Design a protein around this nucleic acid. Structure first.
Ligand SMILES: OC[C@H]1O[C@@H](n2cnc3c(NCCCc4ccccc4)ncnc32)[C@H](O)[C@@H]1O
Ligand SMILES: [K+]
Ligand SMILES: [K+]
Length: 546
DNA sequence: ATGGGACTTTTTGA
DNA sequence: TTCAAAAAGTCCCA
């Protein structure tokens, strides 16, 4: 339903927009929260406004109607002309209306600008000086399909495919912000790097000046909520400089109440600060300090190939109901399944650097079951146990897929070959050579080398550089940060990784072969692997001139 | 009970 | 026909 923003963040966002407002020049500022809820932001806006008017009451009295500008009239003026809110939930609006009314503690029917409505559909009849708040976050699975049709038709500039509802709130906030106005919101951080956020990033960069980005990375800002947050402050002021302040957290384990204010935390050693030229932003926003930019640019300039140039990428199997098709390799039910139907099956946790654990699970590649009479035992006793849920998959409702078939069985011959596999979400680079024809779900991605690039790049060389500390840091510069100690390792970024080939190729490959050989023996002395990795990292840093 | 850690399905638009 | 993206993740315990 409704999510509670921490008070320290609310106060920071309100101060960000109002701390330098010239109330003498403009005593009628319009401040709007478009998903105000119970008024976490708007009630704080009231307090800031009240002090602002009271500190300058005599100056306003002298400059303007001296009967209008009294301390006793500040409450009425704020509610009539300054505070605006919208929310879909009428109970929240009712509570906020009482809270705003009780700030005074009837005289005559004071009107409060609170709208119970869908903020994305409301005919907004004027623009606003300042916009603050915390919009709803709803992804592609959890957003109602009927509503998505409206968003795709009307918010197509920021919303396509797997985009999120809060993209549209960025759009609406920008569109109804007054010229010279200031907006400050807390949203998920994912749009900063995600493929879905590309159009939204283009919309922001070309319509507002981004003053500041506070990136909390994987820190837990909302207690008991699995989301990662950032704060964006932007304006429509005519400026020539357009440089962004970026505050990036250093330690994700920090608790947000370290000081009384967020400014103390931002200026502390817990955060790093650097500046980014908004004019230099491409479709991607590479937000790193100068040392990392130099590091990243050296590697990009030195590497003449990308993984996409040399490799074929694919996502793993999607059965659509794992419990129906995935069995423990020691399950007695597998005696019913001819081994021609059985594939080795691994999870993301089975991928280490350079090699995969031995599989403990088997997939029934049910697409190869010819019909329901020749293998009735498998259908009745294993797969049919989940027949109702299997029939509710989209391709079964439409008749594209039989009820016992895998939803997305892919191509078997893609998996039954030497290939490289990596987990879809990890704390570090973990690229392994698969020797055992392992299948996997979508928590593991795979690629193999194009035949015309085999004489330039071997699998052993590739897992060598890809698992190095250099490439771990290099990938994480632009990688999508998901939660604490987790990055997405998806092809839309993994395949952009650039690779090189030079005089160190042979020794890097040989070091990788030694690592693999040690990792695969029984009396495993894991320690020497670390020494070999350090030597390989030195060769790689020498190659890339870092 | 909360807060922190290990781990990751299938729905969905294109 | 069939690809790949998506954390207001999910679930557990001390
Ligand atoms: O969570 C943050 C706050 O945000 C409010 N809020 C959500 N969503 C809209 C909204 N429009 C989008 C509607 C999306 C939708 C479509 C179908 C069914 C259910 C939701 N407009 C104004 N406040 C909103 C919530 O009430 C809450 O207080
Ligand atoms: K006057
Ligand atoms: K988080």
């Amino acid at each position: 339903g409704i999510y509670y923003t921490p008070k320290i963040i609310v106060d920071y966002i309100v101060k960000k927009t109002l701390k330098n407002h010239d109330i003498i020049k403009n005593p009628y500022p319009r401040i709007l929260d478009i998903s105000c809820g119970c008024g976490n932001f708007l009630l704080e806006v009231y307090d800031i406004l009240y002090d602002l008017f009271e500190e300058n009451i005599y100056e306003l009295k002298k400059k303007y109607d001296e009967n209008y500008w009294t301390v006793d009239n500040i409450h009425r003026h704020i509610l009539n002309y300054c505070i605006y809110g919208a929310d879909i939930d009428e109970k929240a609006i009712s509570i906020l209306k009482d809270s705003l009314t009780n700030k005074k503690v009837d005289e005559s029917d004071i009107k409060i600008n609170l709208f119970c409505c869908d903020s994305l559909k409301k005919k907004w009849r004027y623009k606003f000086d300042y916009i603050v708040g915390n919009p709803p976050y709803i992804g592609h699975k959890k957003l109602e399909k009927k509503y998505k049709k409206f968003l795709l038709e009307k918010y197509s500039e920021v919303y396509k495919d797997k985009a999120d509802l809060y993209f549209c709130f960025y759009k609406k906030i920008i569109d109804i912000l007054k010229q010279g106005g200031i907006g400050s919101v807390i949203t998920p951080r994912y749009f900063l790097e995600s493929l879905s956020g590309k159009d939204l990033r283009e919309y922001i960069k070309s319509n507002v000046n981004v003053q500041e980005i506070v990136d909390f990375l994987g820190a837990n800002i909302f207690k008991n909520i699995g989301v990662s947050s950032c704060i964006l402050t932007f304006d429509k002021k005519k400026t020539k400089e357009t440089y962004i302040d970026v505050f990036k957290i250093k330690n994700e384990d920090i608790c947000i109440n370290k000081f009384e204010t967020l400014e103390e935390l931002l200026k502390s050693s817990k955060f790093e600060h650097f500046n980014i030229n908004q004019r230099l932003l491409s479709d991607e926003w590479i937000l790193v300090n100068k040392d990392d930019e130099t590091f990243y640019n050296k590697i990009q300039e030195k590497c003449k190939y990308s993984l996409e140039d040399i490799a074929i990428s694919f996502q793993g199997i999607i059965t659509g109901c794992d419990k129906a098709f995935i069995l423990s390799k020691d399950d007695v039910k597998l005696n019913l399944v001819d081994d021609k139907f059985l594939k080795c099956w691994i999870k993301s946790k089975n991928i280490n650097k350079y090699i995969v654990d031995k599989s403990e699970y088997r997939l029934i590649y049910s697409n190869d079951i010819d019909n329901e009479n020749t293998n009735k035992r498998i259908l009745d006793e294993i797969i049919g146990l989940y027949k109702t849920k299997l029939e509710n998959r989209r391709e079964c409702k439409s008749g594209i897929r039989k009820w016992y078939e895998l939803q997305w069985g892919r191509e078997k011959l893609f998996f039954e070959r030497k290939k490289i596999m990596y987990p879809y979400k990890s704390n570090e680079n973990r690229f392994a050579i698969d020797y055992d024809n392992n299948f996997s779900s979508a928590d593991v991605y795979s690629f193999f080398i194009k035949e015309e690039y085999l004489d330039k790049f071997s699998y052993e060389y590739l897992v060598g550089i890809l698992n190095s500390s250099v490439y771990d840091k290099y990938f994480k510069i632009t990688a999508k940060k998901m939660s604490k100690n987790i990055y997405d390792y998806y092809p839309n970024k993994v395949m952009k990784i650039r690779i090189f080939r030079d005089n160190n190729y042979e020794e890097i490959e040989n070091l990788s072969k030694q690592i693999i050989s040690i990792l695969l023996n029984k009396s495993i002395d894991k320690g020497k692997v670390e020494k070999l990795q350090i030597k390989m990292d030195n060769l790689i840093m020498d190659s890339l001139g870092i």
